[PDB]
Design an enzyme around this catalytic site. Structure first.
Site, PDB file in Angstrom:
ATOM      1  N   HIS B  41       0.808  -1.212   0.000  1.00 46.47           N
ATOM      2  CA  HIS B  41       0.000   0.000   0.000  1.00 46.47           C
ATOM      3  C   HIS B  41       0.849   1.273   0.000  1.00 46.47           C
ATOM      4  CE1 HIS B  41       0.438   1.211   4.285  1.00 46.47           C
ATOM      5  NE2 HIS B  41       0.523  -0.083   4.523  1.00 46.47           N
ATOM      6  N   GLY B 140       2.833   4.415  10.723  1.00 40.04           N
ATOM      7  CA  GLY B 140       4.229   4.375  10.359  1.00 40.04           C
ATOM      8  C   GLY B 140       4.915   3.087  10.708  1.00 40.04           C
ATOM      9  N   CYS B 142       3.911  -0.097   9.566  1.00 38.80           N
ATOM     10  CA  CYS B 142       3.780  -1.147   8.568  1.00 38.80           C
ATOM     11  C   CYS B 142       5.144  -1.556   8.035  1.00 38.80           C
ATOM     12  CB  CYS B 142       2.910  -0.702   7.404  1.00 38.80           C
ATOM     13  SG  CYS B 142       1.184  -0.608   7.777  1.00 38.80           S
TER      14      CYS B 142
HETATM   15  C1  LIG Z   1       0.950   1.196   7.979  1.00 45.72           C
HETATM   16  O1  LIG Z   1       1.865   1.701   8.973  1.00 45.72           O
HETATM   17  C2  LIG Z   1      -0.411   1.371   8.618  1.00 45.72           C
HETATM   18  C3  LIG Z   1      -0.248   0.779  10.026  1.00 45.72           C
HETATM   19  C4  LIG Z   1      -1.544   0.704  10.797  1.00 45.72           C
HETATM   20  C5  LIG Z   1      -1.838   2.094  11.358  1.00 45.72           C
HETATM   21  C6  LIG Z   1      -2.052   1.858  12.853  1.00 45.72           C
HETATM   22  N1  LIG Z   1      -1.752   0.449  13.081  1.00 45.72           N
HETATM   23  C7  LIG Z   1      -1.362  -0.200  11.987  1.00 45.72           C
HETATM   24  O2  LIG Z   1      -0.899  -1.352  11.942  1.00 45.72           O
HETATM   25  N2  LIG Z   1      -1.451   0.703   7.837  1.00 45.72           N
HETATM   26  C8  LIG Z   1      -2.569   1.346   7.530  1.00 45.72           C
HETATM   27  O3  LIG Z   1      -2.686   2.535   7.721  1.00 45.72           O
HETATM   28  C9  LIG Z   1      -3.708   0.609   6.909  1.00 45.72           C
HETATM   29  C10 LIG Z   1      -3.595   0.785   5.394  1.00 45.72           C
HETATM   30  C11 LIG Z   1      -4.286  -0.236   4.483  1.00 45.72           C
HETATM   31  C12 LIG Z   1      -5.793  -0.135   4.606  1.00 45.72           C
HETATM   32  C13 LIG Z   1      -3.842  -1.655   4.784  1.00 45.72           C
HETATM   33  C14 LIG Z   1      -3.942   0.039   3.020  1.00 45.72           C
HETATM   34  N3  LIG Z   1      -4.923   1.200   7.447  1.00 45.72           N
HETATM   35  C15 LIG Z   1      -5.490   0.778   8.594  1.00 45.72           C
HETATM   36  O4  LIG Z   1      -4.927  -0.009   9.338  1.00 45.72           O
HETATM   37  C16 LIG Z   1      -6.881   1.325   8.909  1.00 45.72           C
HETATM   38  C17 LIG Z   1      -7.196   2.369   7.849  1.00 45.72           C
HETATM   39  N4  LIG Z   1      -7.913   0.293   8.914  1.00 45.72           N
HETATM   40  C18 LIG Z   1      -8.205  -0.390   7.800  1.00 45.72           C
HETATM   41  O5  LIG Z   1      -7.412  -0.505   6.902  1.00 45.72           O
HETATM   42  O6  LIG Z   1      -9.499  -1.014   7.505  1.00 45.72           O
HETATM   43  C19 LIG Z   1     -10.325  -1.821   8.350  1.00 45.72           C
HETATM   44  C20 LIG Z   1     -11.629  -1.067   8.424  1.00 45.72           C
HETATM   45  C21 LIG Z   1     -11.772   0.104   7.688  1.00 45.72           C
HETATM   46  C22 LIG Z   1     -12.939   0.849   7.726  1.00 45.72           C
HETATM   47  C23 LIG Z   1     -13.978   0.401   8.527  1.00 45.72           C
HETATM   48  C24 LIG Z   1     -13.843  -0.770   9.265  1.00 45.72           C
HETATM   49  C25 LIG Z   1     -12.667  -1.510   9.217  1.00 45.72           C
HETATM   50  C26 LIG Z   1      -6.956   2.125  10.220  1.00 45.72           C
HETATM   51  C27 LIG Z   1      -7.520   1.322  11.391  1.00 45.72           C
HETATM   52  C28 LIG Z   1      -5.641   2.836  10.556  1.00 45.72           C
END
Ligand SMILES: *[C@H](O)[C@H](C[C@@H]1CCNC1=O)NC(=O)[C@H](CC(C)(C)C)NC(=O)[C@@](C)(NC(=O)OCc1ccccc1)C(C)C
Ligand SMILES: *[C@H](O)[C@H](C[C@@H]1CCNC1=O)NC(=O)[C@H](CC(C)(C)C)NC(=O)[C@@](C)(NC(=O)OCc1ccccc1)C(C)C
Lengths: 303, 303
Positions: B41, B140, B142
């Site tokens: 991503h 930050g 990931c």
């Molecule tokens: C990369 O560092 C980052 C790390 C996460 C942020 C905090 N903890 C982590 O491990 N990854 C992301 O930001 C990730 C990005 C992708 C969606 C994988 C491309 N985003 C998330 O973790 C979020 C956006 N959640 C979700 O991705 O979706 C599950 C969801 C979404 C909407 C409604 C219900 C469930 C956030 C929780 C940060």
């Protein structure tokens, strides 16, 4: 988010672990610059040692010092209290910026458990009020170190020495002075009555708050005395006004007053946790300093 | 003695952590040989990405790859599922013997939380049955990896990707395939009903036994079915006869039969722990595999 017992990354210390043998005694040593710090009972064979008569009968060649697949040659030895500084002919190329530091009870430090000079695992600990630590140590782990890391600099604060009969552990700082009333000798010694670290439990409660665990909060408040008079009852350790100072930025970021969270800790102590957890734990957890929580709940790195 | 949640020493992995930036997106990558594995991503800017149209519009020069105070030059990039293998012109001198491995739920692995390519901390985790982990990750982090270490060899098994809305985390192995029904996309996804890992809780009970915690034992015994029919009730996960096999050497060293400790776990589940702890914990703790306990309660090192 989330909240784990996080150790410091252990790479800097690994490059400092060595094996030190003397007679039929083998333990771990700490190789910084051209000095190999180890415990001093390695010269033993333990009921009632005069360590000054033991060291004087030693020579340089009695100390086998193994830095992996390389024997290190000792060229002089001295006893600073309960440690042996064996100064050797190679200065360790993986020496890092470091400090010897003596911690205060309540403070927490990573421990790098070692056997035969090979790191076995890494875990986080706290210096209990009674100057013990509760870690994981088997025969052969002495000379393992404990340590925090501040940017690039490594504050060694602990060296394992001995297990007390309640399965707790005792060890020195790196100048060789035991934390507490413990002596490196097979004579009856006992930890002392332990207390809980009130300033760390509130930090941890703040660590719950930042993470969506709000079930243990309330409207109530009370004053520092009125709560410290309950801290005593449940064997917690007195909360100072200087503790409240250090629990500020947590109370800043979450907007929960320190005296209110105390009031909330009261509540919890007097009622228990009635079938719930905080942060995955069904107990109140005092091995997280206020500076831990903000390291972890805000992400400071190291390099 | 003593029993802590012990991580693997983290030094081998530290020398593999790098910073990978692309646009206004920065995360961590894993630099093994001349390839830098990161999440995919990083090419994003997340609601509904076609990652194949995103990667095809990229070029080598869009990937800033920072190995500390040294920019690394990418010379080719490919997407294997949900990871990016950016192959670069320097093979990492701290590459260690390693394996990419896909773990099974119940198995536990050290996690090296990273930000901007600088290791922040290290902690131990378990792959929950519902293919989540409960760790500690902020924006930050990931591209942090999870990993076990077997003598000198490093089995990478996890790379962080995303936090689910219950504060649990989900990520892939190093071939790029998500553990479970999770997709690298900002669409509603939820962990799934979690179960407890019955074979790890018995190990942990054995880990108590070796350490002087015998209050939860009894004379009783029962059969594997009769207990598995209670495992279901309290949402534990079925115990197989192959699990009992793996809980043998623990039952060897302590002379407590596996079916008796099950009978003892029954007792505990049906009665709770009525105001006591095991191993410092007031809960039953399923993030210790049988191979963990014997690593720790017997001291295998690594080099
Ligand atoms: C990369 O560092 C980052 C790390 C996460 C942020 C905090 N903890 C982590 O491990 N990854 C992301 O930001 C990730 C990005 C992708 C969606 C994988 C491309 N985003 C998330 O973790 C979020 C956006 N959640 C979700 O991705 O979706 C599950 C969801 C979404 C909407 C409604 C219900 C469930 C956030 C929780 C940060
Ligand atoms: C060095 O590796 C070794 C490490 C300990 C063994 C297991 N856990 C450890 O941390 N240190 C010792 O063996 C140590 C040696 C000295 C006594 C410090 C020289 N011995 C112990 O830890 C023992 C012998 N306990 C005590 O030393 O004394 C407390 C005591 C003794 C007798 C009666 C009551 C209390 C054992 C507990 C191993």
């Amino acid at each position: 988010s989330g909240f784990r017992k996080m150790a410091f990354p252990s790479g800097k210390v690994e490059g400092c672990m060595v094996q030190v043998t003397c007679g039929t005694t083998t333990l771990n040593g700490l190789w910084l610059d051209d000095v190999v710090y180890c415990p001093r009972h390695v010269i033993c064979t333990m009921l009632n040692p005069n360590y000054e008569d033991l060291l004087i009968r030693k020579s340089n060649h009695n100390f086998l010092v193994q830095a992996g697949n390389v024997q290190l040659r000792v060229i002089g030895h001295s006893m600073q209290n309960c440690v042996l500084k064996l100064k050797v002919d190679t200065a360790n190329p993986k020496t890092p910026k470091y400090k010897f530091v003596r911690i205060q009870p309540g403070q927490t430090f990573s421990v790098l458990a070692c056997y035969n000079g090979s790191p076995s695992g890494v875990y986080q600990c706290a210096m209990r009020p009674n100057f013990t630590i509760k870690g994981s140590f088997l025969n052969g782990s002495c000379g393992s170190v404990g340590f925090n890391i501040d940017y690039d600099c490594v504050s060694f604060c602990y060296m394992h020495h001995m297990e007390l009969p309640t399965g707790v552990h005792a060890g020195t700082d790196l100048a060789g002075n035991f934390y507490g009333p413990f002596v490196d000798r097979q004579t009856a010694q006992a930890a002392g009555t332990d207390t809980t670290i009130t300033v760390n439990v509130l930090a941890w409660l703040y660590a719950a708050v930042i993470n969506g665990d709000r079930w243990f909060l309330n409207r109530f408040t009370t004053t520092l005395n009125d709560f410290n008079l309950v801290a005593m009852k449940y064997n917690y350790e007195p909360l100072t006004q200087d503790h409240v100072d250090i629990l500020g930025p947590l109370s800043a970021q979450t907007g929960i007053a320190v005296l209110d969270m105390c009031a909330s800790l009261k509540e919890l102590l007097q009622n228990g946790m009635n079938g719930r957890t905080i942060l995955g734990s069904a107990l109140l957890e005092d091995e997280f300093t206020p500076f831990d929580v903000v390291r972890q709940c805000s992400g400071v790195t190291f390099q």
